[PDB]
């Protein structure tokens, strides 16, 4: 396998990397605690597209009932860490 033990800061960096390449949102305004519907004015379909992008980038797929209620990068990071059992 030789898979490195991905950590919380690595997950956050990857999440922000994926988000900053989504040109619908400006990289400067976004923050780890920024919202999606209100702080960035993104559509529901747009949020689904972000969720699918993180799905493709991380190699594991999020169930719909849990994907439809993720609205901040911080809670996305927390969900991924809980899925992958990350200590720190």
């Amino acid at each position: 396998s030789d898979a490195p033990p991905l950590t919380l800061e690595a997950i956050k960096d990857r999440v922000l990397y994926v988000l900053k390449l989504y040109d619908k949102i400006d990289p400067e305004k976004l923050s780890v605690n920024s919202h999606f519907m209100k702080d960035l004015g993104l559509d529901s379909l747009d949020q689904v597209e972000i969720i699918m992008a993180m799905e493709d980038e991380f190699g594991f797929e999020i169930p719909d009932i849990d994907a439809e209620k993720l609205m901040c990068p911080q809670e996305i990071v927390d969900y991924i860490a809980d899925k992958k059992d990350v200590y720190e």
Binding site: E68, K69, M71, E75, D78, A81, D82, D85, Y87, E88
Partner: protein, 103 residues
């Protein structure tokens, strides 16, 4: 849509407890303790205790026990061609009748 405040708080507390439990799963340097107690060369010994000894045992078994009984080991008779000589008799098989050879 989205997390309700109760859901957020419960998930946060569960995450904290889960991370504490996972961190507690780590093993310290002295955590694994084993009590000790006792009562070319590698290939050289390997070919002796794994190849040579089975050859000896099986050769003995076939030569002096299996072949003792009749018909246990039966060998297909070797092919005889024109011109060969037989060890047991010494007679020579006659050759062919010189078929016409072109191309």
């Amino acid at each position: 849509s989205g997390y309700t405040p109760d859901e957020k708080l419960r998930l946060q507390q569960l995450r904290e407890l889960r991370r504490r439990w996972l961190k507690d799963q780590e093993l310290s340097p002295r955590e694994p303790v084993l009590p000790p107690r006792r009562v070319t060369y590698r290939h050289s010994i390997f070919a002796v205790t794994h190849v040579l000894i089975p050859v000896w045992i099986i050769h003995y078994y076939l030569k002096y026990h299996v072949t003792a009984k009749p018909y246990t080991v039966v060998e297909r008779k070797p092919r005889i061609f024109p011109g060969d000589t037989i060890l047991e008799t010494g007679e020579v098989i006659p050759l062919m009748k010189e078929f016409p050879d072109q191309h």
